[PDB]
């Protein structure tokens, strides 16, 4: 009878169906949570998504479609809320530690269903501190994919750890659990899956393996906020609140989330100079970092977080539209579409095109249509031109990772993107693609 | 034939300004260097200045029940809040919060203020030291010569980068590393000297450079408390700063900077500061790894506002320290305490006096209970006495006589730009009353 808005990816999916006529129940019920706040001012019984959420203007004039214009990633209402909260924050004089930081950590805890949240100065820092809190020693091996953002390998390397790259599932872009056990040595301590593009990795299977081999699991969920059951099978979950993520602040920040008390204590010590928790200047471990989130950014996060469920839903609506209206191109085998799944928060939108055509498709979309696309990310880990790669990752081949990487093409997708712009993207893809994969 | 007096805002020039602004004639001889750090001076300098009244609003007869050591709400003024709100009104809608134009502009201003060719703004002073060591070519196990009485960030940066701290005794008068004790400690594994301008006092950099040259060592200074020091960085390979909110100049969150004249070195700092990428080419790595440690565009915008108060704020700190040193003279004359020396090479981030080792706890307790005067000790525990596995394992048997003795005597008195002279009166009165024994 009741259709509940949690804001999480599973319920978003059922909300999507329900609003497309397909009744999932009677009463729209909005869960009493900070992440659902902006929904309340726009969600009405007879809501029309195209008009109420996107203000669809089919005939608005469009010459260029930028892939990700940063100015549009923050709205006018967000600006007003931020200025309003800073008006109160600034005179308190508390900019590093303070009450907004604590409140942000409490709110995240509830949203993630994790007992302990340590907010950090970036996502990169979260992974780095997480590895160390979990006991990483120099030379310990960490199993992970090679198609993530460089921050992932970087956090392992900076801590003294050793990346062991394993091939991916070519459709999900995520680490193939069936390739993990092969790569376990007596020096392997961790598995580090990445929920790439917003797609959830096969965490249950990863957990079975990990318990088998007594490894720890720390996930890079920096692109995966809003995923149903995020962290259910992880020892540590890491997040980024960088301004370009599904939810971000106004600078650098991230978080570590865990259910283990002793683990949390250690993360806090590593995040702040190795001090005894809340006892300044008294070290209890060898060293630590200066890597807590700023009180000021936390105050901003408490405002920007009000838009999260609404924005994740708008991302889902966008991804659904793409998948539906481009179906004919996958039907003719010209492109491959991502699967419409509950275990996706659509941080990025990956289609697949023919390898030898991608650069041409990209150029034509831009030249003829003003449509900008991109490829996240241009270089794989084991193909970076560094002294480390040549000495350590020589002649390594990851067939699926490399092939998928050669084919992946990302389309504009973000909460303030417009349907009219999306139409131009799609109209463009049809007019320029004329060969199969 | 009149000598001009340049208001650079640096420590040397502030010292002479202190005399001229105590004097009767204040005319066209006072030349304000065209710099953002001097902005808040332009308005107030167009008339004759009475420091007590114009800068401090001296209210000798005000009721004071408590003197907090560092009330953080008073470290940011109303005009600072307003300027910040005004600039953020412009920054926020641009949507640029990581990289951006205020960041580049803040680095450029710093480069001019410090007289250093390259400034790399970082996410904290702690990261500046860590990145600086790595860019200078630190390898795991490399020994770093340093004092043991700094904030923990100094040693934490050495250790996080793979370095090995080697602690050397200080000059007990200045609290800075004793150049005369550095040479003794040099081994084949020594690669760096890391002096700290502690409390805002300038280390003996010329002598340290001599030793460094002689043994081919790199010098990276922790100047995180030393912004405004004359000739800062002159003999350093890398200078590091902090713009933590509590510093002489700070932003509204964490940030710091690396300063250097060496171009190839600057390049490496950038690479380390941002994922090991080629400069201005995202996703393309040219070194093994790097960090996510640039300063944020938004904090840079706030920095460009707050920096307008630096020269004036540094001047007020000096006037405060000078006032302490003069009015407390008698306590030093009678041998009860030791006062710092009124020098040109100090920016007075903190104000250290020395009291009798045996009486300090009692002095502090009585100041607070009988008079509401809060004092403090930066920092409570020395590096070689931290209860950590590393210390208990590798730094057992290490004795640093001067560091330990001076650390047992030191007492910091409240001093920040918005501190009032009437609060200062009460600090000083309390000190006269509670103290009765010599050192």
What domains, with CATH codes, occur in chain B?
Answer: 1-168+175-309 (3.40.640.10), 310-439 (3.90.1150.10)
Residue in chain B nearest A76 by alpha carbon:
B93
Residue B125 in marked binding region: yes
Residues contacting B188, CB < 8 A, separation 6+:
none
B-chain CB neighbours of A388 within 8 Å are 288-289
Q: B179, B208 in Cβ contact below 8 A? A: yes
DSSP run (H or E) holding A163 = strand A162-165
Which residue matches tokens 């034939």? B1
Between chains, do B93 and A70 touch, taking CB under 8 Å as contact? no
Q: For residues B289 and B367, give the distance between their C-alpha atoms in angstroms, rounded to a whole number.
A: 51
| B126: exposed, middle or buried (Cβ count in 10 Å: 0-12, 13-18, 19+) | buried
DSSP run (H or E) holding A352 = strand A349-352
CA distance B24 to chain A (A): 37
Which string of DSSP letters, residue by residue, matches A1-48? -EEEE--SHHHHHHHHHHHTT--S-SEEEE-SSGGGTTGGGT--TT--
Residue in chain A nearest B290 by alpha carbon:
A154
At A349, is the secondary structure helix, strand, or coil? strand
Query: Which of A430, B112, B405, B344 is closest to A422 using CA atoms?
Result: A430
CA distance A434 to chain B (A): 31
Residue A407 is classified by DSSP as H
Between chains, do B285 and A74 touch, taking CB under 8 Å as contact? no
- Find the angle CA(A417)-CA(A422)-CA(A426) to the nearest 5 degrees: 155
Count A/B contacts: CB-CB distance under 8 Å: 177
At A408, is the secondary structure helix, strand, or coil? strand
Q: For residues B22 and B52, give the distance between their C-alpha atoms in angstroms, rounded to a whole number.
A: 10
Which residue matches tokens 């904090």? B299
Residue B296 touches partner A, C-beta closer than 8 Å:
yes
Query: Which of B134, B120, B93, B81 is closest to B305 using CA atoms?
Result: B81
Residue in chain B nearest A73 by alpha carbon:
B95
Q: For residues B310 and B304, give the distance between their C-alpha atoms in angstroms, rounded to a whole number.
A: 11
Q: For residues A100 and A395, give the distance between their C-alpha atoms in angstroms, rounded to a whole number.
A: 49
Query: Which of A60, A283, A106, A289 is closest to B385 using CA atoms?
Result: A283
Experimental technique behind these coordinates: X-ray
Token pair belonging to B307: 């920096």
Q: Which of B254, B268, B284, B393 to mutate to test the interface with A (most CBs of A within 10 A)?
A: B254
Between chains, do A281 and B381 touch, taking CB under 8 Å as contact? yes
- Find the angle CA(A10)-CA(A16)-CA(A22) to the nearest 5 degrees: 115
Query: Which of A195, A191, A201 is closest to A136 using CA atoms?
Result: A191
C-alpha distance from residue A261 to each of A27, A105, A268 (Å): 39, 15, 11
Query: Using CA of residue B27, residue B31, residue B37, residue B43, what is the dihedral sign?
Result: positive
Q: For residues A397 and A326, give the distance between their C-alpha atoms in angstroms, rounded to a whole number.
A: 33
Buried b (16+ CB within 10 A) or exposed e, A368-381: ebebbbebbbebbb
Query: Which of A348, A353, A349, A350 is closest to A329 using CA atoms?
Result: A353
Q: B92, A250 in Cβ contact below 8 A? A: yes
Chain A, 353 to 382: residues with Cβ < 8 Å from chain B are 377-379
| A388: exposed, middle or buried (Cβ count in 10 Å: 0-12, 13-18, 19+) | middle
Q: For residues A58 and B67, give the distance between their C-alpha atoms in angstroms, rounded to a whole number.
A: 65
Q: Which of A78, A90, A152, A247 to mutate to test the interface with B (most CBs of B within 10 A)?
A: A90
Residue in chain B nearest A149 by alpha carbon:
B283
Q: Which of A96, A243, A290, A393 to mutate to test the interface with B (most CBs of B within 10 A)?
A: A290
Cβ neighbours, 10 Å, residue B371: 19
Buried b (16+ CB within 10 A) or exposed e, B207-234: ebbebbeeeebbbbbbbbbbbbbbebbe
Cβ neighbours, 10 Å, residue B49: 17
Residue B122 touches partner A, C-beta closer than 8 Å:
no
CA distance A22 to chain B (A): 37
Q: Which of A251, A284, A391, A392 to mutate to test the interface with B (most CBs of B within 10 A)?
A: A251
Which residue matches tokens 């706030």? B302
Q: For residues B167 and B146, give the distance between their C-alpha atoms in angstroms, rounded to a whole number.
A: 5
Between strands A275-276 and A408-411, the pairing is unpaired
At A164, is the secondary structure helix, strand, or coil? strand
Q: For residues B389 and A208, give the distance between their C-alpha atoms in angstroms, rounded to a whole number.
A: 34
Token pair belonging to A235: 């020892």
Query: Using CA of residue B137, residue B138, residue B141, residue B142, what is the dihedral sign?
Result: positive
Residues contacting A248, CB < 8 A, separation 6+:
A73, A240, A241, A242, A304
SS (H, E, C) chain B: CCCCEEECCCHHHHHHHHHHCCCCCCCCCEEECCCHHHHHHHHHCCCCCCHHHHCCCCCCCCCCCCECCCCHHHCCCHHHHHHHHHHHHHHHHHCCCCCCHHHHHHHHHHHHHHCCCEEEEECCHHHHHHHHHHHCCCCCCCEEEECCCCCHHHHHHHHHCCCEEEECCECCCCCCECHHHCHHHCCCCEEEECCECHHHECCCHHHHHHHHHHCCCEEEEECCCCCCCCCCCCCCCEEEEECCCCCCCCCCCCCEEEEECCHHHHHHHHHHHECCEECCEEEEECCCCCCECECCHHHHHHHHHHHHHHHHHHHHHHHHHHHHHHHCHHHHHCCCCECCCCCCCECCCCEEEECCCCCHHHHHHHHHHHHCECCECCCCCCHHHCCCHHHHHHCCCCCCHHHHHHHHHEEEECCCCCCCHHHHHHHHHHHHHHCCCCC
Token pair belonging to B435: 């103290």
Q: B285, B276 in Cβ contact below 8 A? A: yes
Buried b (16+ CB within 10 A) or exposed e, A130-154: bbbbbebeeebbbbbbbbbbbbbbb
Residues contacting A265, CB < 8 A, separation 6+:
A277
Cβ neighbours, 10 Å, residue B385: 16
Q: B225, B199 in Cβ contact below 8 A? A: yes
Which residue matches tokens 């659990």? A177
Between strands A408-411 and B218-222, the pairing is unpaired
Residue A290 touches partner B, C-beta closer than 8 Å:
yes
Cβ neighbours, 10 Å, residue A301: 28
Query: Which of A139, A186, A144 is closest to A168 using CA atoms?
Result: A144
Q: A396, A165 in Cβ contact below 8 A? A: yes
Cα B40 off chain centre by? 21
Strands of A179-328 (E only): list them.
188-191, 216-220, 236-240, 254-258, 275-276, 279-283
Torsion angle, CA of A3/A5/A8/A10, rounded to 10 degrees?
10
At A197, is the secondary structure helix, strand, or coil? helix
- Find the angle CA(B220)-CA(B226)-CA(B230) to the nearest 5 degrees: 95
Q: A29, A6 in Cβ contact below 8 A? A: no
Between chains, do B379 and A283 touch, taking CB under 8 Å as contact? no
C-alpha distance from residue A424 to each of A66, A69, A353, A427 (Å): 11, 16, 18, 5
Residue A93 in marked binding region: no
Q: B143, B182 in Cβ contact below 8 A? A: no
Which residue matches tokens 């991109």? A374
Q: Maximum Cα–Cα distance for chain B, whole Å?
A: 67
Residue A236 is classified by DSSP as E
Q: Maximum Cα–Cα distance for chain A, whole Å?
A: 67
Sheet containing strand B238-242, strands side by side:
B118-122, B256-260, B238-242, B218-222, B190-193, B143-146, B164-167
Q: A169, A175 in Cβ contact below 8 A? A: yes
B-chain CB neighbours of A122 within 8 Å are 123, 292
Q: A71, B100 in Cβ contact below 8 A? A: no
Q: For residues A290 and A121, give the distance between their C-alpha atoms in angstroms, rounded to a whole number.
A: 8
C-alpha distance from residue B418 to each of B31, B70, B347 (Å): 25, 10, 15
Instruction: Please report the resolution in angstroms.
Output: 2.3
DSSP run (H or E) holding A152 = helix A150-158
Q: For residues A205 and A149, give the distance between their C-alpha atoms in angstroms, rounded to a whole number.
A: 23
B-chain CB neighbours of A138 within 8 Å are 140
Q: For residues A93 and A176, give the distance between their C-alpha atoms in angstroms, rounded to a whole number.
A: 48
Cβ neighbours, 10 Å, residue B437: 12
Which residue matches tokens 């599904």? A246
Which string of DSSP letters, residue by residue, matches A65-122? B-S--GGGGS-HHHHHHHHHHHHHHHHHT--SSSHHHHHHHHHHHHHHT-SEEEEES-
Query: Which of A112, A115, A88, A111 is closest to A100 using CA atoms?
Result: A88
Between chains, do A388 and B289 touch, taking CB under 8 Å as contact? yes
Between chains, do B74 and A93 touch, taking CB under 8 Å as contact? yes
- How many CA atoms lie less than 13 Å away from B105 in the CB half-sphere? 14
Residues contacting B179, CB < 8 A, separation 6+:
B204, B207, B208, B210, B211
Token pair belonging to A34: 């900070």
Residue B98 in marked binding region: yes
Residue in chain A nearest B163 by alpha carbon:
A287
- Find the angle CA(A392)-CA(A395)-CA(A397) to the nearest 5 degrees: 110
Between chains, do B381 and A87 touch, taking CB under 8 Å as contact? no
Between chains, do B285 and A384 touch, taking CB under 8 Å as contact? yes
Q: For residues B381 and B5, give the distance between their C-alpha atoms in angstroms, rounded to a whole number.
A: 42
Q: What are phi and psi of A164, to 5 degrees?
A: -110, 110
Residue A435 is classified by DSSP as S
Nearest to B98 among A123, A243, A275 (CB): A243
Buried b (16+ CB within 10 A) or exposed e, B393-415: eebeeeebebbbebbebbbbbbb
Q: For residues B165 and B167, give the distance between their C-alpha atoms in angstroms, rounded to a whole number.
A: 6
- Find the angle CA(B435)-CA(B438)-CA(B439) to the nearest 5 degrees: 110
Q: For residues B108 and B100, give the distance between their C-alpha atoms in angstroms, rounded to a whole number.
A: 13
Task: Give bridge partners of residue B351 from the DSSP assignment.
Answer: B413
Nearest to A157 among B288, B299, B386 (CB): B288
Nearest to B92 among A74, A294, A379 (CB): A74
Task: Give bridge partners of residue A237 from the DSSP assignment.
Answer: A219, A257
CA distance B153 to chain A (A): 6
Token pair belonging to B313: 């704020």
Task: Give bridge partners of residue A2 from the DSSP assignment.
Answer: A27
- How many CA atoms lie less than 13 Å away from B117 in the CB half-sphere? 9
Q: B40, B83 in Cβ contact below 8 A? A: no
Q: A183, A210 in Cβ contact below 8 A? A: no
Residue B154 touches partner A, C-beta closer than 8 Å:
no
Q: What are phi and psi of A22, to 5 degrees?
A: -70, 85
Residue A71 touches partner B, C-beta closer than 8 Å:
yes
Residues contacting B211, CB < 8 A, separation 6+:
B179, B182, B183, B186, B193, B217
Q: For residues A125 and A140, give the distance between their C-alpha atoms in angstroms, rounded to a whole number.
A: 18
CA distance B327 to chain A (A): 31
Residues contacting A123, CB < 8 A, separation 6+:
A151, A220, A222, A238, A239, A240, A241, A242, A254, B292
Token pair belonging to A434: 């004329």
Residue in chain B nearest A384 by alpha carbon:
B285
Residue A297 touches partner B, C-beta closer than 8 Å:
yes
Between chains, do A386 and B160 touch, taking CB under 8 Å as contact? no
């Amino acid at each position: 009878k009741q259709v509940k808005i949690s804001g999480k990816s599973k319920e978003n999916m059922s909300l999507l169906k329900h609003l497309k006529g397909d009744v999932q129940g009677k009463e729209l019920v909005i869960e009493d949570s900070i992440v659902n706040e902006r929904w309340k001012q726009v969600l009405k019984e007879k809501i029309d998504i195209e008009h109420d959420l996107f203000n669809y203007q089919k005939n608005r004039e469009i010459s260029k479609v930028p892939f990700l214009p940063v100015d549009r990633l923050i709205t006018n209402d967000e600006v007003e809320d931020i200025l309003n909260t800073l008006t109160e924050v600034l005179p308190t004089g508390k900019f590093t530690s303070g009450p907004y930081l604590e409140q942000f950590e409490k709110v995240l805890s509830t949203y993630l269903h994790k007992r302990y949240v340590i907010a950090t100065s970036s996502g990169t820092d979260a992974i780095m501190i997480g590895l160390l809190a979990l006991g990483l020693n120099p030379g310990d091996e960490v199993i992970m994919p090679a198609n993530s953002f460089s921050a992932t390998e970087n956090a392992v390397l900076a801590s003294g750890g050793v990346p062991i790259y394993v091939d991916i599932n070519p459709q999900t872009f995520c680490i193939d659990p069936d390739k993990i056990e092969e790569a376990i040595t007596p020096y392997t301590k961790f598995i580090l899956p990445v929920h790439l593009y917003g797609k959830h990795s096969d965490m249950q299977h990863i957990r079975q393996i990990a318990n088998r081999y007594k490894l720890k699991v720390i996930e890079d969920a920096c692109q995966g906020i809003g995923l149903t059951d995020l962290g259910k099978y992880a020892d540590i979950t890491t997040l980024s609140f960088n301004p370009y993520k599904n939810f971000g602040v106004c600078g650098k920040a991230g978080a570590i989330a865990t259910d283990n008390e002793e683990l949390a204590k250690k993360c806090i010590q590593f995040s702040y100079h190795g001090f005894e928790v809340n006892v300044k200047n008294k070290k209890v471990i060898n060293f630590g970092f200066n890597s807590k989130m700023d009180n000021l950014q936390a105050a901003i996060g408490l405002e920007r977080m009000k838009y999260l469920s609404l924005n994740n839903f708008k991302r889902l609506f966008l991804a659904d539209r793409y998948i539906t209206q481009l179906a004919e191109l996958q039907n003719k085998g010209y492109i491959e579409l991502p699967e419409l799944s509950e275990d996706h928060v659509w941080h990025l939108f990956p289609i697949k095109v023919r390898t030898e055509d991608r650069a041409d498709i990209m150029t034509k979309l831009n030249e003829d249509f003003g449509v900008q696309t991109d490829v996240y990310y241009p270089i794989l880990s084991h193909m970076q031109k560094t002294p480390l790669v040549q000495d350590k990752y020589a002649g390594l081949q990851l067939v699926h990772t490399e092939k998928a990487h050669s084919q992946v093409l990302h389309l504009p997708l973000y909460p303030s993107f417009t349907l009219e712009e999306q139409d131009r993207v799609m109209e463009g893809l049809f007019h320029v693609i004329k060969q199969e994969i």
